[PDB]
Design a binder for this molecule. Sequence first.
Ligand SMILES: C[C@H]1CC[C@@H](NCc2ccc3c(c2)Cc2c(-c4ccc(C(=O)O)cc4)n[nH]c2-3)CC1
Length: 269
Amino acid sequence: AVPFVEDWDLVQTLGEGAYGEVQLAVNRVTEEAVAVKIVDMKRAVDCPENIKKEICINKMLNHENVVKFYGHRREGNIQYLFLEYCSGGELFDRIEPDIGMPEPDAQRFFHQLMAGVVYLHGIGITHRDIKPENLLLDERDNLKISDFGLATVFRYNNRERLLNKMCGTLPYVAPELLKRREFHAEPVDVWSCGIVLTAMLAGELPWDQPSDSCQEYSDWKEKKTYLNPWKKIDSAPLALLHKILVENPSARITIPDIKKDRWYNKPLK
Ligand SMILES: C[C@H]1CC[C@@H](NCc2ccc3c(c2)Cc2c(-c4ccc(C(=O)O)cc4)n[nH]c2-3)CC1
């Protein structure tokens, strides 16, 4: 038994918000770095319930493109979650405003993103809030899906549960969430991934939200890809977006088919 190995020093605030804050912790002995999410179980139906679900889901996660879950510590009202420290930071910061990033980097990040999503969907888990700020990068620039505070189970005992809860982030949310009472979970995550792809290649989001009243969204459905925000995206990745950002979730391309898309399998480019 090595003394002090259980002592972690909080040396930097990684993130802060409703949930509370995320601090970088370094092991007193080994100097190992991890991310510690601090969530004060206040209110009632709030944290006490929400944080418990987030924990159960994290305990199911084990994939190279998903933030690792080390464990959790509860000290009365305060709840501590020991998660993977990704020194690379948020993919969000790798996105140059109005520019994006080199197509090959985006393709690489997109490959890793799909890998993570396939994994989650494979074990019946939907994230429900995929966006650049939740996509982390490690020291080698490997994409990691993070924050399962909005995640939930959509498949259990081989039976799919349709969803109806409106959650996520408007710019990334699928249109069916704003138009239908119930919807299939998977196409919703594929959609947000497409908006993330769009952001990586153009450095701007296509619309405030996917609805009629939204100008750019209507233009997209009218295929006005000329000059408009899609003007900055090469034709190959654009052909993929045309298949992902499809109004009808039933007609939307699935991940197995995205894996077959030409740009997706295009070397480097
Ligand atoms: C304070 C300044 C310097 C650091 C910057 N942040 C970069 C950064 C670097 C490494 C990070 C995170 C952010 C966020 C995070 C997480 C993380 C894991 C899991 C969750 C979650 O489960 O919700 C949230 C955040 N692990 N590693 C990191 C912000 C301004």
